[PDB]
Amino acid sequence: QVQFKLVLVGDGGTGKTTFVKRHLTGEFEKKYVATLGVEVHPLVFHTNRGPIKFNVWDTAGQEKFGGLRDGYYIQAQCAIIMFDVTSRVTYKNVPNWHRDLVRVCENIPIVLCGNKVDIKDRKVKAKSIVFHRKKNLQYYDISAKSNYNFEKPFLWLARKLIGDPNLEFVAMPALAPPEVVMDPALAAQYEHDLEVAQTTALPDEDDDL
Amino acid sequence: GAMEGILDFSNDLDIALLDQVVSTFYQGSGVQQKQAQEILTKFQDNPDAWQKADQILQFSTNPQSKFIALSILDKLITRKWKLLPNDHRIGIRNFVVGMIISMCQDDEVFKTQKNLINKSDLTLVQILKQEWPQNWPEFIPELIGSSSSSVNVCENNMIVLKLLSEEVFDFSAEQMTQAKALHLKNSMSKEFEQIFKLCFQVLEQGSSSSLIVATLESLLRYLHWIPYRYIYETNILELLSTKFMTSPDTRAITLKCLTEVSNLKIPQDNDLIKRQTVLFFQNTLQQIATSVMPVTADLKATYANANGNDQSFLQDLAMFLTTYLARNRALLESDESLRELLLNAHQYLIQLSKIEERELFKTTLDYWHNLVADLFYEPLKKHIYEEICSQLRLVIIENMVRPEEVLVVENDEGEIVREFVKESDTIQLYKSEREVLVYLTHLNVIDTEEIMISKLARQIDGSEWSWHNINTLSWAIGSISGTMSEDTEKRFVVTVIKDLLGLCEQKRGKDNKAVVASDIMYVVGQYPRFLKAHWNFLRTVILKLFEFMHETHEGVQDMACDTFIKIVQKCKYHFVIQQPRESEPFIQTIIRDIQKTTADLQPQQVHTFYKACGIIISEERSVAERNRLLSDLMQLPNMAWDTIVEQSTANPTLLLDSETVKIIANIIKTNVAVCTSMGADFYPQLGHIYYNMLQLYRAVSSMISAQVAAEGLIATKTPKVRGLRTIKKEILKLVETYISKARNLDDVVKVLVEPLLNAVLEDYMNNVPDARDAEVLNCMTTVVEKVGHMIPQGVILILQSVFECTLDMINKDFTEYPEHRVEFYKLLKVINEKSFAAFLELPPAAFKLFVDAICWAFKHNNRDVEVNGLQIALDLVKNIERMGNVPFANEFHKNYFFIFVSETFFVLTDSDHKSGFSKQALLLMKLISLVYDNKISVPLYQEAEVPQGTSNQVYLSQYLANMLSNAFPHLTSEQIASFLSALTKQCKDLVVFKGTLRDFLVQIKEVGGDPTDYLFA
Amino acid sequence: EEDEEVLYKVRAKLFRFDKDAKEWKERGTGDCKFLKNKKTNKVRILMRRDKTLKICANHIIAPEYTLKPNVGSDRSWVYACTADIAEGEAEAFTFAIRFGSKENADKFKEEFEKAQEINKK
Ligand SMILES: *[C@H](CC(=O)O)[C@H](C)[C@@H](O)/C=C/C(=C\[C@H](C)C/C=C/C(C)=C/[C@@H](C)C(=O)[C@@H](C)[C@H](O)[C@@H](C)C/C(C)=C/C(=O)O)CC
Ligand SMILES: Nc1nc2c(ncn2[C@@H]2O[C@H](COP(=O)(O)OP(=O)(O)NP(=O)(O)O)[C@@H](O)[C@H]2O)c(=O)[nH]1
Ligand SMILES: [Cl-]
Ligand SMILES: [Cl-]
Ligand SMILES: [Cl-]
Ligand SMILES: [Cl-]
């Protein structure tokens, strides 16, 4: 199938894994569990040019959990560089990540992403963000939390790899869902399982939704 | 299973098995790939693993295997090189060089193994950083010689020199000591003469080669640092600006070199150099016009098509043109023979600025701002650019982004709806566009008006009608406010509004109406000066906004409220006075009808509306009248309040009602809103509700506690309990808001403080952790900030009530109770600044926890906590020093001086706290300087630990050397000694001190660091 | 979806209960639609994520289902679904769906139960 190796790089805590998870399952992981070396995930998108598959190599940003480091970049066909707009040092290191990346991957499309724009006290000013200009990187402000611009990096990359600037995400057809009846046996457990659910509070009850 | 075998080193390395594991990782999937990954990481991390490196390079049939082999060496070279026996160093150098030579001679391997060859070069360069040129003097000459022998080797040499230049000049600041960076820069500099010679020859004997491309790649790096003469005193500008511009595979890199050249350090008064700078630009523009596209070409369309490398090229062109012109346009401005060039270059920029690419647009807009700002000031320049500016006016007006105030947007179905969210990322773009457009208007106000008015006509007659066109136009019209004379503005704005109304009269349906509404609202909100001169008009505008407050279209409704307050913020004076031919100040009218007007608004919109009224009322400086207006404003919330207070007093059950909770919350929020705008003036209204409000705080607190007892912690998640806490939180917010603005501090202390503390502290202290409001802490910070000095016993009370219980919530990890965590340290900080005595009163055990708390803050990665932790520490030290030679100061130093020093070193040296480096360094410097300046009156060492005579200076060195020696056992004694000597001497010069710290941080990452590096000056 | 009538549309956020973990996890934010098949008269829930338009819910509104309240919310329903096909293979979930308002939550419940009756016929 039409699939592309995507490497995702940037400092620890910038939101790389959370970003990928959001796209994978729809979930927002609140906890920070450091990535160990790399985590490879298949990610499919439906487009007016057919399906496009990214194999996302979600790499570790913490030096001590770096694993093979630039070894992960071998034969990457595209990349996302992530920083955290509430953390200046993460932007400062962007050239470092870029350097190590382009040494291995000389001519790939790359998106620079400034994550966590949902947070009121922004530190890396919009005006400051210029590293991408001389390097021909696409840039987006994003939030994995609020989903601000969350689709943009993948839409842009899909356009660049398929070579079609008019490429759009399209709604997948929706098969008729089945007519299933709950079976006698498990009906007892369904009550217990449901009970735990009702009495476990939904997260972020203060959001708009 | 079988895979793990390669981790066993006592067995000889099965290379075949390695390749399987590698391929499994690279081309595999799911569980298998994952297991291979872990395996390979462990293999790589094995400290003997490098010994297998030659075996792998020699025998592997898999390039990723060798790549990984090279990563293993790289790790060894960069970190453990000088620990290796000399022969392993020779041998490693040899097989790296040999592998490179070998891979360059076989054209197939050279052609199809670029990744592995690039890795090999980088690895080689790592060896050069260690060994060159002191232990490898001939490397440059031999590289130069080797180059003429083979096209492949020569090209690959260019890769190597590029990498070397990078590692020495571009990326050395973070990665090497100051001394070693200087050594390598100096070394490269001393031999660059010969490097350049080769680079020039190669460039002269080829046209469109991978070798040429490679050479130019290296040249781009050199341009960061080389002396200007290499650029200006050779033929190189000619080659770059002509020959290398013509072929497309060299054009990209050449343009980037030329951009960098446009940034060289270059004499100001040298007429011939000037001429050379004109000539390369002239050449370059000529090649573009004849080899790529003419000035008339539709770059918007070209970019949009996205063929080959067109986007990148256009991006690089924009960068070249803007860079060059920003520095040099003046060279082109006075000489008539250069006029066409100047304008042509700018015409390309005009075409570039039409491209649909936001990031690219920002790059060109930055340039336009640079241009127009200069034309605004510099005599006799604007006429040159009059036609360019005229075109630019069109471009900006037609690409105005949606202002933050325009709350309606069109959805995917052609519907005008309220926005789901703020377009946070177009805020800076709008400001940038406005700024440029504002300058353009000043530069030619006739042209700007003629353009806008005539565009408007083509909306009316239908010729160019569309939501996009009316929008961008309206936004632009609003954005130029302040540029015209009042008189011109008068006529201008009159025309615009008549026309917008006429336009609205024509259009029909809810979507059209929403759009034109939003545009009119935006425009009127942008012209307060006009509004102030046109009372009748202003009054009619406000009444219309009130009508919109009943709109079923929510975007329009919401925008009406924002527009109302926006106008009031600027025009409030005209609402407070009685206007001619009016029977009352308009504020009176607004208040009288407030229930009708706000009937259909959401609560927060109602609060905004009340906030706006507060702004107006605060204009009334007569105290009696102002208070009367305030009273009148608060009539509805105060009557709701009075009735609620009766009910609560009668029985606590009614508060139980969910509807009642919401009513109460909205009353308090309304008070918060009005207090926000009236500040100090709000006091009488506060005094009306204050005692019952604190009673209600208590009643509601009991309810929460009761609910938790009855239902468990999970009760805190319930609508009921969140609603009850909202009440508490809003009450805290109201008091905080008032106190933050209070002008009568005596009344704060005499009337507000005692009942507030009584109501809030014990409740906080005696609730379970999950039921404690962080807002209490936030409220107390403001109380301490504003009246802290006047309430020493009160501050003691605050500490007692919140310190130990809050610390215990936050001291098990870095994540739980994030709000408490942040507010806790802000409170500690202000207390430490304003009422340090409160800490003096603490029992010694609680004072120890205080010191623990501070250091705990250090270790946070969370900047909000970390920063405050470092400040508190610095402040505390100051507070102590200030006490002078008294027992508490002496005991403090005896107990805590070394705890602070070692803790500060810990976060400095652990690589996990890099964000705090500056404040850490400042703290460390202060601490060291205290000893260096004999500012500690007692021995820091317990007796018999050391000889009696011994100075604190000697002992401090001794403590630190020992600390570092155990903490970093791979350092030598001399490294440590030299580091401490340097550091202690430099404890008065923060910039030098910091550099010595950074050098230390480099050295601890490797073995055999040179101790003399600390002599750098 | 051309063979279907749109009975009800409402903006929503959908969660699924992870049991192994003791937590709700978001599945998607977007338009939750009730769709009546013109051929079979059957009524399903279909919901797609904003921007990517990916299906995050696809199941019949079975007559057997019951919308229950969640302890944390006055604007949400929880129910057990035995056969959702959004991911692919038919699969059982415990779902939670939260709305912009209580009005919306109450309106949804009403429509849901109307749909259940249509589905009985
Ligand atoms: C659609 C209306 C339609 O269906 O046709 C739009 C969206 C309207 O609903 C929205 C209108 C808004 C504001 C108007 C601008 C408010 C009207 C003010 C008005 C008529 C004021 C009178 C008193 C004037 O002064 C008139 C007579 C005068 O011609 C004005 C327009 C120009 C002036 C001030 C001339 C002067 O010489 O001073 C939405 C906020
Ligand atoms: N406020 C906010 N927090 C976010 C956002 N994205 C991620 N986070 C949070 O930031 C933390 C780190 O996220 P994570 O994805 O683990 O970062 P990472 O770059 O993968 N770290 P590592 O490189 O060590 O694997 C998490 O607590 C996560 O919830 C965002 O958009 N906004
Ligand atoms: Cl390779
Ligand atoms: Cl020279
Ligand atoms: Cl005014
Ligand atoms: Cl030594």
Ligand SMILES: [Mg+2]
């Ligand atoms: Mg991660």
